[PDB]
Write a protein that binds this ligand. Structure first.
Ligand SMILES: Nc1ncnc2c1ncn2[C@@H]1O[C@H](COP(=O)(O)OP(=O)(O)OP(=O)(O)O)[C@@H](O)[C@H]1O
Ligand SMILES: Nc1ncnc2c1ncn2[C@@H]1O[C@H](COP(=O)(O)OP(=O)(O)O)[C@@H](O)[C@H]1O
Lengths: 755, 131
């Protein structure tokens, strides 16, 4: 029966869309823009407009929240769709605003909300429906309580609208909107899908899996920075799927006087079990269940034991599911990890770049913005923030925008109308001012992401590029060849050469190309850890790396550790021993199933311990040659890609004269030339100012002042202060180590043996 | 590396539990690795874990002296730098029987080659002797 359709989540947010595939259009021979009749649960009736969408399957109907609530149904149910061509243009419509939707407006609903939303829409409406309208910066619901014809009718230009009277009393099963939904979350699509897949089935079908007799999960942990929306996620899931959300807070429990707390806890569970399949969310667990050594008195231990017993004693039976929110999965007591206890754990990573953009779009939805708005730049510059941070920044930007208009917006009072405040076009001045008074929260926090470094960013070292491609991409792309041959790919790769010159650039480029997460470990912070934490810290670092598989781990200046071992002190070597032992133990603990490459950059391979250089550890050593002519030319071109042009010299000529210079030196030379150009522009502007004061308002057009390009004079200025970063003895020692390696693997030519 | 980690702090209980676990699983063959790492850290530019290393080795010696001949559990130690080893280990009752491992050659090389060359893609190969 290709007429009943299973309702699911939708893509179009318009109030009058039911999405059908083109074969479905062919099936019923329906028109586009025609009204169709929808029948569902609670004996509800709806009228809607058919729209085209090839994403939905033939048996799938895509349809938003407003009309889904109009039928008083949720996703996953079955509805009946039929043609309704007998609809005709409406005559009069009397609507009535909801009580808690128009507070603090004092305006003409016709000329701000009714006129634009109802314009050229032709949305069919039936008596009893509720429709939401976006406004200046608020969204307001209206309930159509009378219409001609009744109950179903067509919104037409020849309709008189009456929206005067006492607000209608709130309904009961109307499933009031303005609640959190799946769309209301940005930047966490992967985790959202992961949690949706393994939670929806037991709740939507409490008896189906019971008939299957497969034990569902009972406890899920969510950990991350505070204020990232974990409570928001839980509330949205409860609202969307349909459940009996029951929130309990740890500080509330701690506020009570001992025993009743536990009783309250008991009450909570006996509340949820008797109210059908329900969902329980508990927050700030470490605040009530920290590590047992952190626990000092006996009351907290009693509470912990009580909650453990309560949660274990409800093993399945009732379909209640509980999740918890915390900061990190390393502060709570470890006993809350057993089978049947909290076992499935999820991290909520910091939104970055794109996710920040969707967060802004979600928050910057209602208030009207100026055409100057450039959200992409804001998302680029803003990092180390959370959804709450961006919401606060948007709030303060709106406050600044309104504040500067007191004279125009009648600073006194007189209950400013909606259209007057509508004029507050948000400007980049407001955003910059808000950013001036801005404070991030994450800051000193590890970030896992995919960098955006391209292959053309470097001279190329095409042999090394191909070798790394062979090492990484093919093993995961085509495991069949290895499993047939029985070869296990290596894991630890090391680089050595002049300081810098692409190492980190190579790591970022390969991470970007392979489309895998990147984790960086720095020598300075390594030595910071070196005093104190040396065993646990590596443990959670590698646990985090394992969780983000597939990913690539990078180590910067590993020899710095041996720099403490071999240096001007040579006395704190116990910590270095601890670090090395931890690293080796973890490397031996790395299973072959995990696909995580490890890269290490070392300037001096000789000082470092050769014990690392063994099978099952870092084995592939790649030398870094100095940039040479064409490589230098490409590097200079990449540097010049920023803004100015160098159409006054010969780049390869300069490379010829500047042999033996690292790419870092070339970038520094470019920066010096840029500084000279900036100073030239500044002095040209100063001369313009001087001639302005000598003759007021003489001439103000743009003179031949330095615009973005590097003239030759700047080039001599830059080349004069050119640095030979690497001394010859450094090349001597690099080639000494290379020849040491070659002598071991030394077999002069061949003779085609066994011929 | 695990032993060197156990040098600082958690040493006594680990040794006791590992020897007890070996003892209850009799008969068994306890094995050791990096037996020269203790002496490698004993003499060098670190000079930090020497006290912990000496404590660990003393504990090991005492506990292995503490076993009863009833338990049919054997002990095997391996190293590649035997000179740096403390003579106290090379004592009666302690490790006394010593075996040198000569490098493979020809017959040994061909044997290890033909023992490791299982794989799926054997091709048809050539003479292992000249290899
Ligand atoms: N992806 C997002 N989309 C929309 N709003 C978001 C998002 N992430 C965070 N927010 C906002 O940040 C705030 C987070 O609120 P809330 O305290 O409920 O979150 P939380 O992460 O569960 O908090 P907690 O610190 O208690 O663990 C809210 O104002 C919410 O609107
Ligand atoms: N376009 C480029 N081509 C090649 N090398 C580059 C380019 N841009 C920057 N580099 C190199 O990247 C290096 C970064 O240095 P640094 O991060 O301190 O050491 P490492 O690269 O070993 O991590 C610089 O020394 C510079 O020479």
């Amino acid at each position: 029966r290709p007429n009943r359709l299973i309702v699911d989540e939708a893509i179009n947010e318009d109030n009058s869309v039911v999405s059908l595939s083109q074969p479905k259009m062919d099936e019923l021979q329906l028109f586009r823009g025609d009204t169709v009749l929808l029948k569902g649960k609670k004996r509800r009736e709806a009228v809607c407009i058919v729209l085209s969408d090839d994403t939905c399957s033939d048996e799938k109907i895509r349809m938003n929240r407003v009309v889904r609530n109009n039928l008083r149904v949720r996703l996953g149910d079955v509805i009946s769709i039929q043609p309704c061509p007998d609809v005709k243009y409406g005559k009069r419509i009397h609507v009535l605003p909801i009580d808690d939707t128009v507070e603090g407006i004092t305006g003409n609903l016709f000329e701000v909300y009714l006129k634009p939303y109802f314009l050229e829409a032709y949305r069919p409406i039936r008596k009893g429906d509720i429709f939401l309208v976006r406004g200046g910066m608020r969204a307001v619901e209206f309930k159509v309580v009378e219409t001609d014809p009744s109950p179903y009718c067509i919104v037409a230009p020849d309709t008189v609208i009456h929206c005067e009277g006492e607000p209608i009393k709130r309904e009961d099963e109307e499933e009031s909107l303005n609640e959190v939904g799946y769309d209301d979350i940005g930047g966490c699509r992967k985790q959202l899908a992961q949690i949706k897949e393994m939670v929806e089935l037991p709740l939507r079908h409490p008896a189906l899996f019971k008939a299957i007799g497969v034990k569902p999960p009972r406890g899920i942990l969510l950990y991350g920075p505070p204020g990232t929306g974990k409570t928001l996620i839980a509330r949205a899931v409860a609202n969307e799927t349909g459940a009996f959300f029951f929130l309990i807070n740890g500080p509330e429990i701690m506020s009570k006087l001992a025993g009743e707390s536990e009783s309250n806890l008991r009450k909570a569970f006996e509340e949820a079990e008797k109210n059908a399949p329900a969902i329980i969310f508990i927050d700030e667990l470490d605040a009530i269940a920290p590590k047992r050594e952190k626990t000092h008195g006996e009351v907290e231990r009693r509470i912990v034991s009580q909650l453990l017993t309560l949660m274990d004693g409800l093993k399945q039976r009732a379909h209640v599911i509980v999740m918890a929110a915390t900061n990190r999965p390393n502060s709570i007591d470890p006993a809350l990890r057993r089978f049947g206890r909290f076992d499935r754990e999820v991290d909520i990573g910091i939104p970055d770049a794109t996710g920040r953009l969707e967060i802004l779009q979600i928050h910057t939805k209602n208030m009207k913005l100026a055409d100057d708005v450039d959200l992409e730049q804001v998302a680029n510059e803003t990092h180390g923030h959370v959804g709450a941070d961006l919401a606060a920044l948007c709030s303060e930007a709106a406050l600044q925008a309104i504040r500067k208009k007191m004279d125009l917006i009648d600073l006194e009072d007189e209950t400013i109308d909606a259209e007057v405040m509508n004029s507050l076009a948000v400007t980049m001045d407001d955003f910059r001012w808000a950013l001036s008074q801005s404070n991030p929260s994450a800051l000193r926090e590890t970030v896992v992401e995919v960098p955006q470094v391209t292959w053309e960013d470097i001279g190329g070292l095409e042999d090394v590029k191909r070798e790394l491609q062979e090492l990484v991409q093919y093993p995961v792309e085509h495991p069949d060849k290895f499993l047939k041959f029985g070869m296990t790919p290596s894991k630890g790769v090391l680089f050595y050469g002049p300081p810098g010159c692409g190492k980190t650039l190579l790591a970022k480029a390969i991470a970007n190309e392979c489309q895998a997460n990147f984790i960086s470990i720095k020598g300075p912070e390594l030595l910071t850890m070196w005093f104190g934490e040396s065993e646990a810290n590596v443990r959670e670092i590698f646990d985090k790396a394992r969780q983000a598989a597939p990913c690539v781990l990078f180590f910067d200046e590993l020899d710095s550790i041996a720099k403490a071992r071999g240096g001007n002190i040579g006395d704190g070597g116990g910590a270095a021993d601890r670090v090395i032992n931890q690293i080796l133990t973890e490397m031996d603990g790395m299973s072959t199933k995990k696909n995580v490459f490890i890269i290490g950059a070392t300037n001096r391979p000789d000082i470092i311990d050769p014990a690392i250089l063994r099978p099952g550890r870092l084995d592939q050593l790649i030398y870094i040659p100095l940039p040479d002519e064409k490589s230098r030319v490409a590097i200079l071109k990449a540097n010049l890609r920023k803004s100015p042009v160098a159409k006054d010299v010969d780049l390869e000529f300069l490379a010829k004269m500047t042999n033996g210079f690292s790419g870092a030196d070339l970038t520094e030379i470019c920066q010096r030339a840029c500084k000279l150009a900036i100073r030239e522009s500044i002095e040209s502007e100063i001369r313009r100012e001087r001639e302005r004061q000598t003759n007021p308002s003489a001439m103000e057009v743009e003179e031949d002042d330095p615009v973005p390009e590097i003239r030759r004079d700047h080039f001599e200025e830059a080349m004069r202060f050119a640095r030979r970063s690497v001394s010859d003895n450094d090349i001597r020692k690099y080639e000494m180590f290379a020849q040491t390696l070659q002598q071991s693997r030394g077999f002069g030519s061949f003779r085609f043996p066994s011929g």
